[PDB]
Amino acid sequence: ISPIETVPVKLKPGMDGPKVKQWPLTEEKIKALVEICTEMEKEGKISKIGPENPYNTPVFAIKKKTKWRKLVDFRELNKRTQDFWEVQLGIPHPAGLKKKKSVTVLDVGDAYFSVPLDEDFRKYTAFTIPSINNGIRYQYNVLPQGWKGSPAIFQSSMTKILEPFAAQNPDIVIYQYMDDLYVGSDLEIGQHRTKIEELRQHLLRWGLTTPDKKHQKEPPFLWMGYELHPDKWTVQPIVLPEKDSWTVNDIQKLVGKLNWASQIYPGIKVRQLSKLLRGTKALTEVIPLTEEAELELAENREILKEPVHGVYYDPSKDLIAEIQKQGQGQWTYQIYQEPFKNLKTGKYARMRGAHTNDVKQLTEAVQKITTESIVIWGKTPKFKLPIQKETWETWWTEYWQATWIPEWEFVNTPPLVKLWYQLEKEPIVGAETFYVDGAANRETKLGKAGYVTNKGRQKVVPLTNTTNQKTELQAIYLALQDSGLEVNIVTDSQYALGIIQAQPDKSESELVNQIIEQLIKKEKVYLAWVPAHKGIGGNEQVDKLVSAG
Amino acid sequence: PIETVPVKLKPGMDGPKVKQWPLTEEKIKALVEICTEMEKEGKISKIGPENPYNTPVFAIKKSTKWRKLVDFRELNKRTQDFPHPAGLKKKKSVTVLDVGDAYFSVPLDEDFRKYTAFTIPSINNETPGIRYQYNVLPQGWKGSPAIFQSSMTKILEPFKKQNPDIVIYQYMDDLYVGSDLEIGQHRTKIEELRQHLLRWGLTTPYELHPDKWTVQPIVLPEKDSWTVNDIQKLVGKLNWASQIYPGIKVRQLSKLLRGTKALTEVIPLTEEAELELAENREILKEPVHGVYYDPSKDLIAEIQKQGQGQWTYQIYQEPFKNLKTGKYARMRGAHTNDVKQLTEAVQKITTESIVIWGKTPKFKLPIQKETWETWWTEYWQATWIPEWEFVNTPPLVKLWYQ
Ligand SMILES: Cc1c(Oc2ccccc2OCCn2ccc(=O)[nH]c2=O)cc(F)c2ccc(C#N)cc12
Ligand SMILES: [Mg+2]
């Protein structure tokens, strides 16, 4: 059976075929293998070969507890064969599927064995059925199951086979995925069944069998962790385990399932649990759960208590995305066309840095949504965002990094995204001027943070187990604590300057968080920088006060 | 043209396997039209799954008609085999000409074609992408001008004979033509070259003035009244510039702040401090001493957002050894944004880099990776693509190059 053209296949340059000897099998397995191989030889799938075939690949037979199955171990051959154009890893997203009136699922029986294998390559597929004394030599004529090239070559072959039928039927949408075809149309159910039958016979003309009965799979369709209904889609039931102790592996599977749930369950928070997963040790060890992780998991359970579904896509309707804050660095979003009918949902809880602010994270969320939208629908959505033009404009204008803001409408739905504080751009008249400095011994880890002001005020606070950077931040914090509502602050630390000028409203470190609370409580704060050890004036006094001691 | 030039890859190196970026339905449709027509003209052919290689493709505008741009950066890195005039930057006027179409006259080495494989992506992974490979010399591949070089010299020979003082340098798909003539004479000569190329079957469907390019001298503020904060800023900046210019001093300036002063206190510039500042203004006029270009080292370009449509940039090979500096500006018109301006800036800097040294620099872009990857094609008009990475570096670098 060679109506299907073969794909030319070569081994990796400098490599020869596999010569893995056949492991000894029991008599029953030998019998089963003999019968199965005679049936396959009868169908032209394999052929008995001469004695001078130097190559061999181990063969096995089993029946997972009635039927027997032949499994071949092509690991060596696979390692010795060329690379192919990568088979589709990515699956279509249900929220991207366009609602059809009629839908059919076709399972291709014995997919690989229906496609011929390149002639010059068949000798490398040689396997041996063991004789009782010591054997029968065989080789494949079709795509072997478990071989490296089978999925891609079957894919290609199926595409080429489908091309004419698709050419004569442009009103029929055909998805191709592994050994499955998913066929949709808007024709009348009867003539849709007719078109399906035509496709079936056409495929049968190329040696591809389809379900003969009324097609084995009916709605809803269980597929890759999804439930596909006629008018809606959702995820398969997510069961979160309840354990006293948790290993790294358990937490990985947990955050896995929560990630999976987040695409349709709005409000899922995975962050604290992944914070637990920051211990990138072996997957064995027990990781103690943090209170925040407990609360997070509990809230997740509360969310997963209610059934949720998504709708399919309509190209004529606009694409709309909404974003809401979920608390400390966590965000959630909904993508829909009909106001309460979600195409899908999602989350965003990345800091990508020790410190950040709400507007930055919002912009990043918008970026993620944009990318995802391009991937799923091939277009960017309109944005309804809980932030005002003045806020965002001020931010992206003052932001030293280039950013892309879409067209969006302000939706007033608390909590609104806002600038909790804004540093002054000019020094403040009448406000006290704190010259600050922090120092630390890089050996004893002891340190001190101090200030000297223009009003003649001086102070030094001792610190244990710290570093110079943290002492500089500590110095800024000290200046905030002991000052009025308006304050000028001068530092020689480029580090601290960089952290404060970025104007964060959330942080990993509690010190920076305290500083943030202080900045929020203030009315006007101006931060200035000077080069250290230059005898500037004010800075030299605090240095001499705090650097040596 | 039957005789193809045998192309090889560097020893112990396999072809490119780069991910194809997701595209909007618009761009995909455009690419399908373009590639259908290219296939009808024998320029490309469909390939089977036995070809594992891949090279990204994008749809741009360069006109209203869509253009196809291929990112051959990886293939260019993995394939090499084999000059730049220093006088090009001296010329008064330099005009760039697109001569890429000529490459489609020459067949590509049959054994090498599989390495030019590319994919037109599908939406939502509905179908596997449409895969092609090139039958002819593709635009954007560094092998194409190398192979076409003899033909190009052949066609250009009469014109160069006629115009000995005119400089012609080729970089990838572009021809750089420099003269010291008057602008009208220049453009006339340019048009003569164009018509020559056209009548010799070389289709050519942007003029610079490197005579005005320079390394920007550091500028110090000028104020009627100085506050403590102003003098602090000045001392910090001069201290920064002292790493580059040795003779800079700040003693007399910093002396004016002795004690613990309020930031907003007005400080009079004494005679000594003003002398020091004047001297420092004088030393910043002269160019740096020991900075020379190394052809064996990578060119690095850093960029800073200055606001109000202004962007500063530096090209260097080693830190604090700027080969060139500059400031790009764009009239808002309310139609502009950060990404547009940054893209334009990158293209201008790259052009200048090509004109001066004959290669593209490695960019450090002040932007989030995914944002750039999303929107960079929207304003990209060039046929080449430089290397780039993504950084922060905000804190003092802005106001110093400002
Ligand atoms: C059955 C079907 C599809 O169907 C479609 C096939 C072709 C074109 C458009 C389709 O669907 C549009 C959306 N939709 C969906 C299900 C339904 O019942 N009705 C619909 O309208 C599309 C898919 F990705 C499928 C993936 C896996 C499986 C399985 N097992 C079946 C699928
Ligand atoms: Mg210090």
PDB file of N, CA and C in Angstrom, chain A residues 7-8 82-85 88 90 92-93 96 155-156 175 352 367 375-376 378 396 399-404 428 433 435 453-454 488 501 526 528-531 534 536-538, chain B residues 17 24-25 49-51 119 123-128 131 229 232-233 235 239 254 257 259-264 305 338-339 366-368 370-371 374-375 391-392 394-396:
ATOM      1  N   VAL A   7       8.461   9.956   3.349  1.00  0.00           N
ATOM      2  CA  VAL A   7       9.391  11.001   3.737  1.00  0.00           C
ATOM      3  C   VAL A   7      10.792  10.418   3.836  1.00  0.00           C
ATOM      4  N   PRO A   8      11.748  10.996   3.095  1.00  0.00           N
ATOM      5  CA  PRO A   8      13.129  10.510   3.152  1.00  0.00           C
ATOM      6  C   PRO A   8      13.731  10.721   4.536  1.00  0.00           C
ATOM      7  N   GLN A  82      17.928  11.151  12.776  1.00  0.00           N
ATOM      8  CA  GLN A  82      17.905  12.601  12.594  1.00  0.00           C
ATOM      9  C   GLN A  82      16.766  13.268  13.352  1.00  0.00           C
ATOM     10  N   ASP A  83      16.885  14.577  13.541  1.00  0.00           N
ATOM     11  CA  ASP A  83      15.797  15.358  14.106  1.00  0.00           C
ATOM     12  C   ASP A  83      14.757  15.644  13.029  1.00  0.00           C
ATOM     13  N   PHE A  84      13.535  15.926  13.462  1.00  0.00           N
ATOM     14  CA  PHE A  84      12.453  16.260  12.547  1.00  0.00           C
ATOM     15  C   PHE A  84      11.834  17.581  12.965  1.00  0.00           C
ATOM     16  N   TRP A  85      11.069  18.197  12.068  1.00  0.00           N
ATOM     17  CA  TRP A  85      10.306  19.381  12.439  1.00  0.00           C
ATOM     18  C   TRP A  85       9.406  19.010  13.609  1.00  0.00           C
ATOM     19  N   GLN A  88       3.424  19.203  16.829  1.00  0.00           N
ATOM     20  CA  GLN A  88       2.759  20.221  17.628  1.00  0.00           C
ATOM     21  C   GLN A  88       2.808  19.848  19.099  1.00  0.00           C
ATOM     22  N   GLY A  90       1.980  22.499  21.324  1.00  0.00           N
ATOM     23  CA  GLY A  90       0.905  23.351  21.784  1.00  0.00           C
ATOM     24  C   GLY A  90      -0.437  22.897  21.255  1.00  0.00           C
ATOM     25  N   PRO A  92      -4.688  23.554  20.821  1.00  0.00           N
ATOM     26  CA  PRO A  92      -5.600  24.694  20.707  1.00  0.00           C
ATOM     27  C   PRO A  92      -6.264  24.990  22.042  1.00  0.00           C
ATOM     28  N   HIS A  93      -6.470  26.262  22.353  1.00  0.00           N
ATOM     29  CA  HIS A  93      -7.169  26.605  23.579  1.00  0.00           C
ATOM     30  C   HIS A  93      -8.662  26.693  23.302  1.00  0.00           C
ATOM     31  N   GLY A  96     -10.466  29.673  22.234  1.00  0.00           N
ATOM     32  CA  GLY A  96     -10.162  30.174  20.906  1.00  0.00           C
ATOM     33  C   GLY A  96     -11.020  29.542  19.826  1.00  0.00           C
ATOM     34  N   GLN A 155       1.859  13.213  10.787  1.00  0.00           N
ATOM     35  CA  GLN A 155       1.256  14.539  10.727  1.00  0.00           C
ATOM     36  C   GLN A 155       1.276  15.088   9.301  1.00  0.00           C
ATOM     37  N   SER A 156       2.472  15.131   8.722  1.00  0.00           N
ATOM     38  CA  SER A 156       2.667  15.595   7.352  1.00  0.00           C
ATOM     39  C   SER A 156       1.796  14.829   6.363  1.00  0.00           C
ATOM     40  N   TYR A 175      -9.717  20.404  12.340  1.00  0.00           N
ATOM     41  CA  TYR A 175      -8.578  20.443  13.249  1.00  0.00           C
ATOM     42  C   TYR A 175      -7.863  19.100  13.229  1.00  0.00           C
ATOM     43  N   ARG A 352       9.213  40.031  39.635  1.00  0.00           N
ATOM     44  CA  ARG A 352      10.405  40.176  38.788  1.00  0.00           C
ATOM     45  C   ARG A 352      11.337  41.277  39.296  1.00  0.00           C
ATOM     46  N   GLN A 367       0.628  43.386  29.541  1.00  0.00           N
ATOM     47  CA  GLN A 367       1.553  42.765  28.592  1.00  0.00           C
ATOM     48  C   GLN A 367       1.272  41.269  28.424  1.00  0.00           C
ATOM     49  N   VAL A 375      -1.732  34.993  20.946  1.00  0.00           N
ATOM     50  CA  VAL A 375      -1.580  33.550  20.770  1.00  0.00           C
ATOM     51  C   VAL A 375      -2.917  32.844  20.510  1.00  0.00           C
ATOM     52  N   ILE A 376      -3.955  33.222  21.250  1.00  0.00           N
ATOM     53  CA  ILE A 376      -5.221  32.492  21.205  1.00  0.00           C
ATOM     54  C   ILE A 376      -6.174  32.967  20.103  1.00  0.00           C
ATOM     55  N   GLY A 378      -5.315  35.796  17.860  1.00  0.00           N
ATOM     56  CA  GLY A 378      -4.615  36.486  16.792  1.00  0.00           C
ATOM     57  C   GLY A 378      -4.935  37.968  16.740  1.00  0.00           C
ATOM     58  N   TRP A 396       3.996  56.495  33.476  1.00  0.00           N
ATOM     59  CA  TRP A 396       4.751  56.108  32.285  1.00  0.00           C
ATOM     60  C   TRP A 396       5.574  57.270  31.743  1.00  0.00           C
ATOM     61  N   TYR A 399       8.479  57.325  34.159  1.00  0.00           N
ATOM     62  CA  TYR A 399       9.164  56.035  34.134  1.00  0.00           C
ATOM     63  C   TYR A 399      10.332  56.049  33.148  1.00  0.00           C
ATOM     64  N   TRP A 400      11.528  55.757  33.652  1.00  0.00           N
ATOM     65  CA  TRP A 400      12.752  55.800  32.852  1.00  0.00           C
ATOM     66  C   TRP A 400      12.805  54.706  31.790  1.00  0.00           C
ATOM     67  N   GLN A 401      11.968  53.690  31.949  1.00  0.00           N
ATOM     68  CA  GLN A 401      11.943  52.576  31.013  1.00  0.00           C
ATOM     69  C   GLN A 401      10.798  52.745  30.016  1.00  0.00           C
ATOM     70  N   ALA A 402      11.024  52.333  28.772  1.00  0.00           N
ATOM     71  CA  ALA A 402      10.016  52.480  27.725  1.00  0.00           C
ATOM     72  C   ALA A 402       8.878  51.490  27.920  1.00  0.00           C
ATOM     73  N   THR A 403       7.648  51.970  27.783  1.00  0.00           N
ATOM     74  CA  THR A 403       6.485  51.115  27.977  1.00  0.00           C
ATOM     75  C   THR A 403       5.416  51.381  26.929  1.00  0.00           C
ATOM     76  N   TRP A 404       4.600  50.369  26.662  1.00  0.00           N
ATOM     77  CA  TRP A 404       3.540  50.487  25.671  1.00  0.00           C
ATOM     78  C   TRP A 404       2.179  50.375  26.341  1.00  0.00           C
ATOM     79  N   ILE A 428      13.017  70.965  48.980  1.00  0.00           N
ATOM     80  CA  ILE A 428      11.906  71.602  49.678  1.00  0.00           C
ATOM     81  C   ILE A 428      12.353  72.741  50.589  1.00  0.00           C
ATOM     82  N   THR A 433      16.848  69.428  56.595  1.00  0.00           N
ATOM     83  CA  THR A 433      17.718  68.670  55.704  1.00  0.00           C
ATOM     84  C   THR A 433      18.536  67.638  56.469  1.00  0.00           C
ATOM     85  N   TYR A 435      21.208  64.854  56.457  1.00  0.00           N
ATOM     86  CA  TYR A 435      22.306  64.147  55.817  1.00  0.00           C
ATOM     87  C   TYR A 435      22.426  62.800  56.507  1.00  0.00           C
ATOM     88  N   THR A 453      21.566  66.927  60.813  1.00  0.00           N
ATOM     89  CA  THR A 453      20.696  67.862  60.105  1.00  0.00           C
ATOM     90  C   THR A 453      21.232  69.288  60.140  1.00  0.00           C
ATOM     91  N   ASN A 454      20.618  70.161  59.346  1.00  0.00           N
ATOM     92  CA  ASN A 454      21.017  71.561  59.297  1.00  0.00           C
ATOM     93  C   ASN A 454      20.525  72.328  60.518  1.00  0.00           C
ATOM     94  N   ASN A 488      13.995  66.981  53.528  1.00  0.00           N
ATOM     95  CA  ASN A 488      15.012  66.760  52.510  1.00  0.00           C
ATOM     96  C   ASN A 488      15.998  65.710  53.001  1.00  0.00           C
ATOM     97  N   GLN A 501      14.230  55.833  44.451  1.00  0.00           N
ATOM     98  CA  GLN A 501      13.813  56.542  43.239  1.00  0.00           C
ATOM     99  C   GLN A 501      12.852  55.727  42.376  1.00  0.00           C
ATOM    100  N   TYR A 526      12.102  64.863  49.471  1.00  0.00           N
ATOM    101  CA  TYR A 526      13.067  64.995  48.387  1.00  0.00           C
ATOM    102  C   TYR A 526      14.352  64.261  48.731  1.00  0.00           C
ATOM    103  N   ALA A 528      18.206  63.404  47.672  1.00  0.00           N
ATOM    104  CA  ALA A 528      19.335  63.873  46.879  1.00  0.00           C
ATOM    105  C   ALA A 528      20.536  62.958  47.066  1.00  0.00           C
ATOM    106  N   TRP A 529      21.397  62.903  46.055  1.00  0.00           N
ATOM    107  CA  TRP A 529      22.598  62.085  46.130  1.00  0.00           C
ATOM    108  C   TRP A 529      23.857  62.922  45.944  1.00  0.00           C
ATOM    109  N   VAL A 530      24.906  62.569  46.679  1.00  0.00           N
ATOM    110  CA  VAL A 530      26.217  63.185  46.504  1.00  0.00           C
ATOM    111  C   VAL A 530      27.287  62.099  46.505  1.00  0.00           C
ATOM    112  N   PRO A 531      28.406  62.337  45.801  1.00  0.00           N
ATOM    113  CA  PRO A 531      29.520  61.384  45.859  1.00  0.00           C
ATOM    114  C   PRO A 531      30.131  61.321  47.253  1.00  0.00           C
ATOM    115  N   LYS A 534      34.075  63.089  49.440  1.00  0.00           N
ATOM    116  CA  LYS A 534      34.456  64.231  48.619  1.00  0.00           C
ATOM    117  C   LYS A 534      34.395  65.520  49.429  1.00  0.00           C
ATOM    118  N   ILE A 536      31.935  67.046  50.795  1.00  0.00           N
ATOM    119  CA  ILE A 536      30.868  67.907  50.295  1.00  0.00           C
ATOM    120  C   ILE A 536      30.406  68.925  51.330  1.00  0.00           C
ATOM    121  N   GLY A 537      30.059  68.440  52.515  1.00  0.00           N
ATOM    122  CA  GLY A 537      29.507  69.293  53.548  1.00  0.00           C
ATOM    123  C   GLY A 537      28.146  68.771  53.952  1.00  0.00           C
ATOM    124  N   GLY A 538      28.023  68.368  55.209  1.00  0.00           N
ATOM    125  CA  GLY A 538      26.828  67.693  55.670  1.00  0.00           C
ATOM    126  C   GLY A 538      27.035  66.196  55.564  1.00  0.00           C
TER     127      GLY A 538
ATOM    128  N   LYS B  17      17.648  26.694  14.830  1.00  0.00           N
ATOM    129  CA  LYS B  17      16.383  26.139  15.302  1.00  0.00           C
ATOM    130  C   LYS B  17      15.700  27.124  16.244  1.00  0.00           C
ATOM    131  N   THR B  24      -0.394  38.200  14.762  1.00  0.00           N
ATOM    132  CA  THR B  24      -1.802  38.521  14.588  1.00  0.00           C
ATOM    133  C   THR B  24      -2.302  37.989  13.248  1.00  0.00           C
ATOM    134  N   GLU B  25      -3.617  37.836  13.131  1.00  0.00           N
ATOM    135  CA  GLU B  25      -4.239  37.311  11.918  1.00  0.00           C
ATOM    136  C   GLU B  25      -3.862  38.133  10.688  1.00  0.00           C
ATOM    137  N   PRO B  49       8.606  17.177   6.900  1.00  0.00           N
ATOM    138  CA  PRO B  49       9.008  17.121   8.310  1.00  0.00           C
ATOM    139  C   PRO B  49      10.461  16.687   8.524  1.00  0.00           C
ATOM    140  N   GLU B  50      11.146  16.258   7.467  1.00  0.00           N
ATOM    141  CA  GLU B  50      12.538  15.833   7.597  1.00  0.00           C
ATOM    142  C   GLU B  50      13.471  17.037   7.697  1.00  0.00           C
ATOM    143  N   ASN B  51      12.895  18.232   7.616  1.00  0.00           N
ATOM    144  CA  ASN B  51      13.636  19.466   7.837  1.00  0.00           C
ATOM    145  C   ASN B  51      13.325  20.014   9.227  1.00  0.00           C
ATOM    146  N   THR B 119       8.783  29.231   9.034  1.00  0.00           N
ATOM    147  CA  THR B 119       7.421  28.809   9.335  1.00  0.00           C
ATOM    148  C   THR B 119       6.452  29.980   9.439  1.00  0.00           C
ATOM    149  N   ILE B 123      -2.863  30.534  14.037  1.00  0.00           N
ATOM    150  CA  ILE B 123      -3.493  31.062  15.235  1.00  0.00           C
ATOM    151  C   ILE B 123      -3.913  29.914  16.139  1.00  0.00           C
ATOM    152  N   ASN B 124      -3.650  30.056  17.436  1.00  0.00           N
ATOM    153  CA  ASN B 124      -4.162  29.135  18.447  1.00  0.00           C
ATOM    154  C   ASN B 124      -3.770  27.679  18.200  1.00  0.00           C
ATOM    155  N   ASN B 125      -2.651  27.472  17.509  1.00  0.00           N
ATOM    156  CA  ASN B 125      -2.160  26.130  17.195  1.00  0.00           C
ATOM    157  C   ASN B 125      -3.206  25.248  16.521  1.00  0.00           C
ATOM    158  N   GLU B 126      -4.090  25.865  15.742  1.00  0.00           N
ATOM    159  CA  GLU B 126      -5.138  25.127  15.048  1.00  0.00           C
ATOM    160  C   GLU B 126      -4.521  24.149  14.061  1.00  0.00           C
ATOM    161  N   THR B 127      -3.604  24.659  13.248  1.00  0.00           N
ATOM    162  CA  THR B 127      -2.888  23.846  12.278  1.00  0.00           C
ATOM    163  C   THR B 127      -1.389  23.966  12.517  1.00  0.00           C
ATOM    164  N   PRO B 128      -0.611  22.981  12.046  1.00  0.00           N
ATOM    165  CA  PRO B 128       0.833  23.215  12.081  1.00  0.00           C
ATOM    166  C   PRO B 128       1.178  24.321  11.097  1.00  0.00           C
ATOM    167  N   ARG B 131       5.382  25.549   6.228  1.00  0.00           N
ATOM    168  CA  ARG B 131       6.840  25.590   6.197  1.00  0.00           C
ATOM    169  C   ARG B 131       7.433  25.703   4.800  1.00  0.00           C
ATOM    170  N   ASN B 229      21.730  72.308  46.697  1.00  0.00           N
ATOM    171  CA  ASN B 229      21.367  71.164  45.873  1.00  0.00           C
ATOM    172  C   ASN B 229      21.958  71.240  44.460  1.00  0.00           C
ATOM    173  N   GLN B 232      25.599  70.547  44.623  1.00  0.00           N
ATOM    174  CA  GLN B 232      25.754  69.115  44.855  1.00  0.00           C
ATOM    175  C   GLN B 232      25.629  68.325  43.550  1.00  0.00           C
ATOM    176  N   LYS B 233      24.594  68.634  42.773  1.00  0.00           N
ATOM    177  CA  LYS B 233      24.394  68.015  41.462  1.00  0.00           C
ATOM    178  C   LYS B 233      25.599  68.242  40.559  1.00  0.00           C
ATOM    179  N   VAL B 235      28.714  68.986  41.435  1.00  0.00           N
ATOM    180  CA  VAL B 235      29.895  68.300  41.942  1.00  0.00           C
ATOM    181  C   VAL B 235      29.822  66.808  41.633  1.00  0.00           C
ATOM    182  N   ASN B 239      32.385  64.970  39.179  1.00  0.00           N
ATOM    183  CA  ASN B 239      33.045  63.796  39.725  1.00  0.00           C
ATOM    184  C   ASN B 239      32.891  62.614  38.783  1.00  0.00           C
ATOM    185  N   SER B 254      33.194  72.363  46.049  1.00  0.00           N
ATOM    186  CA  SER B 254      32.708  71.664  47.232  1.00  0.00           C
ATOM    187  C   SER B 254      32.983  72.460  48.508  1.00  0.00           C
ATOM    188  N   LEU B 257      30.195  74.492  50.234  1.00  0.00           N
ATOM    189  CA  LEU B 257      29.152  73.787  50.971  1.00  0.00           C
ATOM    190  C   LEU B 257      29.633  73.304  52.337  1.00  0.00           C
ATOM    191  N   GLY B 259      30.195  72.724  56.048  1.00  0.00           N
ATOM    192  CA  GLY B 259      29.206  72.859  57.099  1.00  0.00           C
ATOM    193  C   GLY B 259      28.016  71.972  56.803  1.00  0.00           C
ATOM    194  N   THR B 260      26.924  72.180  57.529  1.00  0.00           N
ATOM    195  CA  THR B 260      25.712  71.398  57.324  1.00  0.00           C
ATOM    196  C   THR B 260      24.567  72.317  56.911  1.00  0.00           C
ATOM    197  N   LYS B 261      24.412  72.503  55.605  1.00  0.00           N
ATOM    198  CA  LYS B 261      23.493  73.504  55.073  1.00  0.00           C
ATOM    199  C   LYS B 261      22.144  72.929  54.664  1.00  0.00           C
ATOM    200  N   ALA B 262      21.132  73.791  54.641  1.00  0.00           N
ATOM    201  CA  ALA B 262      19.840  73.433  54.077  1.00  0.00           C
ATOM    202  C   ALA B 262      19.977  73.361  52.563  1.00  0.00           C
ATOM    203  N   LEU B 263      19.335  72.370  51.951  1.00  0.00           N
ATOM    204  CA  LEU B 263      19.472  72.134  50.516  1.00  0.00           C
ATOM    205  C   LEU B 263      19.081  73.342  49.669  1.00  0.00           C
ATOM    206  N   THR B 264      18.072  74.084  50.114  1.00  0.00           N
ATOM    207  CA  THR B 264      17.545  75.198  49.328  1.00  0.00           C
ATOM    208  C   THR B 264      18.275  76.520  49.579  1.00  0.00           C
ATOM    209  N   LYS B 305      16.188  56.887  28.296  1.00  0.00           N
ATOM    210  CA  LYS B 305      15.004  57.716  28.112  1.00  0.00           C
ATOM    211  C   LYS B 305      15.123  58.998  28.934  1.00  0.00           C
ATOM    212  N   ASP B 338       6.616  55.649  23.440  1.00  0.00           N
ATOM    213  CA  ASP B 338       7.953  55.219  23.847  1.00  0.00           C
ATOM    214  C   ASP B 338       8.556  54.179  22.904  1.00  0.00           C
ATOM    215  N   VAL B 339       7.760  53.178  22.542  1.00  0.00           N
ATOM    216  CA  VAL B 339       8.233  52.092  21.691  1.00  0.00           C
ATOM    217  C   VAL B 339       8.624  52.591  20.301  1.00  0.00           C
ATOM    218  N   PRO B 366      16.468  49.758  27.226  1.00  0.00           N
ATOM    219  CA  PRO B 366      15.724  50.103  28.441  1.00  0.00           C
ATOM    220  C   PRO B 366      14.233  49.830  28.279  1.00  0.00           C
ATOM    221  N   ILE B 367      13.876  48.553  28.184  1.00  0.00           N
ATOM    222  CA  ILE B 367      12.492  48.149  27.979  1.00  0.00           C
ATOM    223  C   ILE B 367      12.304  46.701  28.426  1.00  0.00           C
ATOM    224  N   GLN B 368      11.085  46.355  28.831  1.00  0.00           N
ATOM    225  CA  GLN B 368      10.763  44.978  29.176  1.00  0.00           C
ATOM    226  C   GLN B 368      10.811  44.098  27.928  1.00  0.00           C
ATOM    227  N   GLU B 370       9.359  41.289  26.819  1.00  0.00           N
ATOM    228  CA  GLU B 370       8.140  40.858  26.144  1.00  0.00           C
ATOM    229  C   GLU B 370       7.450  42.007  25.408  1.00  0.00           C
ATOM    230  N   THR B 371       7.557  43.216  25.952  1.00  0.00           N
ATOM    231  CA  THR B 371       6.973  44.395  25.317  1.00  0.00           C
ATOM    232  C   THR B 371       7.662  44.683  23.983  1.00  0.00           C
ATOM    233  N   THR B 374       6.886  42.139  21.479  1.00  0.00           N
ATOM    234  CA  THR B 374       5.523  42.310  21.000  1.00  0.00           C
ATOM    235  C   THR B 374       5.416  43.402  19.939  1.00  0.00           C
ATOM    236  N   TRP B 375       6.037  44.552  20.184  1.00  0.00           N
ATOM    237  CA  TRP B 375       5.745  45.715  19.346  1.00  0.00           C
ATOM    238  C   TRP B 375       6.866  46.221  18.429  1.00  0.00           C
ATOM    239  N   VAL B 391      17.757  45.830  29.806  1.00  0.00           N
ATOM    240  CA  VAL B 391      18.392  46.256  31.047  1.00  0.00           C
ATOM    241  C   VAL B 391      17.600  47.321  31.792  1.00  0.00           C
ATOM    242  N   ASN B 392      18.170  47.788  32.898  1.00  0.00           N
ATOM    243  CA  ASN B 392      17.567  48.840  33.705  1.00  0.00           C
ATOM    244  C   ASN B 392      18.444  50.088  33.751  1.00  0.00           C
ATOM    245  N   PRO B 394      18.861  52.762  35.647  1.00  0.00           N
ATOM    246  CA  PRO B 394      18.314  54.122  35.703  1.00  0.00           C
ATOM    247  C   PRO B 394      19.111  55.188  36.477  1.00  0.00           C
ATOM    248  N   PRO B 395      19.827  54.796  37.547  1.00  0.00           N
ATOM    249  CA  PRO B 395      19.787  55.772  38.643  1.00  0.00           C
ATOM    250  C   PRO B 395      20.443  57.136  38.402  1.00  0.00           C
ATOM    251  N   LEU B 396      21.734  57.205  38.096  1.00  0.00           N
ATOM    252  CA  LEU B 396      22.333  58.509  37.807  1.00  0.00           C
ATOM    253  C   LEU B 396      22.688  58.738  36.341  1.00  0.00           C
TER     254      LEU B 396
END
